[PDB]
Write a protein that binds this ligand. Structure first.
Ligand SMILES: Cc1cc2nc3c(=O)[nH]c(=O)nc-3n(C[C@H](O)[C@H](O)[C@H](O)COP(=O)(O)O)c2cc1C
Length: 147
């Protein structure tokens, strides 16, 4: 199966979780493509992919509710071609804030609205992949069960 992991990371934690997931999922025997959202072009982004994993860290203040580069992507979700594609979301954040990883539900909500099938429960964790290998690895496993 072909998996795209697109992520937005401003201090590298979500980017870190994305690296790990690719690792874990490629060890499942799959072809994975890692994509920085700062380098992504929404238009037809999902073409050729069996599933798409979206990573977006949380930023409560100035930043309209999401990470920079992901916000520009998200806003063009309906150009991505998610209809009938497997999708899941993950994020790094901090519990000490009122809204912990609020972009996870949003991504699931939108993708679902566009004909996409959520295959795994949203990953909400703190720190990098090494901070919570177990949470990371449950997300990957869930994913691998639908591929
Ligand atoms: C100014 C600021 C506001 C933040 N607001 C939130 C927020 O409201 N919700 C949340 O879950 N995390 C929030 N965070 C915590 C970051 O999301 C956390 O450090 C995360 O792991 C960084 O993700 P990234 O390195 O992948 O970009 C905030 C961080 C900063 C410094």
């Amino acid at each position: 199966s072909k998996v795209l992991i697109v992520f937005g990371s401003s201090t590298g934690n979500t980017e870190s979780i994305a690296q790990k997931l690719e690792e874990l999922i490629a060890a499942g025997g799959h072809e994975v493509t890692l994509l920085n959202a700062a380098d992504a072009s929404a238009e037809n982004l999902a073409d050729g992919y069996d599933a798409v994993l979206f990573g977006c860290s949380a930023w409560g203040m100035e930043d309209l509710e999401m990470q920079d580069d992901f916000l520009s992507l998200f806003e063009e979700f309906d150009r991505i071609g998610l209809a009938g594609r497997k999708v899941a979301a993950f994020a790094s954040g901090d519990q000490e804030y009122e809204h912990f990883c609020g972009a996870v539900p949003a991504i699931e909500e939108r993708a679902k609205e566009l004909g996409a099938t959520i295959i795994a429960e949203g990953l909400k964790m703190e720190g990098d992949a090494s901070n919570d290998p177990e949470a990371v690895a449950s997300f990957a496993e869930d994913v691998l069960k639908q591929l």
